[PDB]
Design a protein around this ligand. Structure first.
Ligand SMILES: CCCCCCCCCCCC[N+](C)(C)[O-]
Ligand SMILES: CCCCCCCCCCCC[N+](C)(C)[O-]
Ligand SMILES: CCCCCCCCCCCC[N+](C)(C)[O-]
Ligand SMILES: CCCCCCCCCCCC[N+](C)(C)[O-]
Ligand SMILES: CCCCCCCCCCCC[N+](C)(C)[O-]
Ligand SMILES: CCCCCCCCCCCC[N+](C)(C)[O-]
Ligand SMILES: CCCCCCCCCCCC[N+](C)(C)[O-]
Ligand SMILES: CCCCCCCCCCCC[N+](C)(C)[O-]
Ligand SMILES: CCCCCCCCCCCC[N+](C)(C)[O-]
Ligand SMILES: CCCCCCCCCCCC[N+](C)(C)[O-]
Ligand SMILES: CCCCCCCCCCCC[N+](C)(C)[O-]
Ligand SMILES: CCCCCCCCCCCC[N+](C)(C)[O-]
Ligand SMILES: [Cl-]
Lengths: 97, 98
């Protein structure tokens, strides 16, 4: 694996709390198919089933502002909070910067 | 059970290209340990080993600017580009409903 973890949560009524595991795959060398040809699947074919749309939109939402960075040992995460629709969201992101 | 896909890539020399699969787990009901207690690992224990630090920094880099949205059928993705260090990165993120 190449893997990092993020966290995401809502405020208010019906607040949700999600762990999200980001698995990275390098596309520099593609896999082979049964005929020995390069298989381009990993470059365009998305995984599924997807989580609820408001959760995906919340996690992927563009937001430039960082409320602050947390740290313990040599692990640093950044916390962001923002509104999508009428819901307030927080996400916590690995940030080795 | 619950998964979305994003794409990440560099411009220029030693330009890289990554698929990132995002696996979501709902933490509302924790799993049980062998003695019947609630196990809190999923709320704080990060997965690993991690990809290169510059790759993580680039994918995670906060950024509010969207160069544009791409669409086919009922699938919409947003494309963002920005500089990290001396490298220009693009990322493609699933974005309902834009
Ligand atoms: C070694 C024991 C560690 C246990 C610490 C548990 C404290 C977490 C409490 C979560 C509180 C949620 N909230 C939003 C009110 O902060
Ligand atoms: C295979 C049926 C359709 C052909 C798709 C082949 C796409 C070639 C893409 C070139 C990109 C190669 N590279 C090294 C950047 O990964
Ligand atoms: C049957 C499907 C055929 C798909 C062929 C798609 C060709 C895409 C080539 C990748 C382009 C690389 N680059 C740098 C210009 O983005
Ligand atoms: C740089 C990535 C370019 C590779 C993209 C290849 C897209 C091929 C889509 C072909 C559609 C397959 N099918 C089964 C619907 O015919
Ligand atoms: C169904 C969703 C389709 C997603 C396909 C996205 C392909 C991204 C192509 C990026 C390639 C850029 N570059 C420079 C490596 O060629
Ligand atoms: C720079 C290369 C561009 C690659 C873009 C390839 C897009 C393929 C989209 C296939 C999705 C069609 N589908 C299944 C959603 O209907
Ligand atoms: C080493 C990584 C440390 C991660 C820190 C996680 C912080 C989450 C804080 C949520 C509670 C915020 N507040 C306002 C109640 O303090
Ligand atoms: C060994 C220490 C374990 C302490 C467990 C921390 C309890 C925090 C509870 C947070 C509640 C989250 N949720 C969704 C289950 O409600
Ligand atoms: C609501 C968020 C839940 C946060 C709860 C975090 C539990 C952390 C427990 C850490 C214990 C590690 N230790 C010291 C036992 O090895
Ligand atoms: C070093 C890993 C850091 C552990 C990350 C802990 C994330 C906990 C975030 C607080 C959860 C807020 N809430 C509402 C569920 O209590
Ligand atoms: C909002 C309250 C939740 C805060 C929980 C943050 C947990 C930090 C876990 C760091 C793990 C430390 N250690 C030694 C087990 O690696
Ligand atoms: C389902 C929609 C997915 C469309 C994703 C297409 C993104 C590929 C962009 C690569 C380069 C675009 N370009 C050459 C115009 O700059
Ligand atoms: Cl993000």
């Amino acid at each position: 694996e190449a893997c990092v973890t993020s966290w995401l949560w809502s405020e208010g009524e019906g607040a949700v709390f999600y762990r999200v595991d980001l698995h990275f795959t390098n596309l520099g060398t593609p896999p082979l198919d049964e005929d020995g040809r390069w298989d381009p699947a990993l470059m365009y074919n998305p995984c599924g089933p997807e989580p609820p749309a408001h959760v995906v939109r919340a996690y992927n939402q563009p937001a430039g502002d960082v409320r602050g960075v947390w740290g313990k040992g040599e692990r640093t995460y950044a916390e962001q909070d923002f509104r999508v629709g009428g819901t307030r969201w927080h996400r916590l992101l690995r940030m080795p910067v």
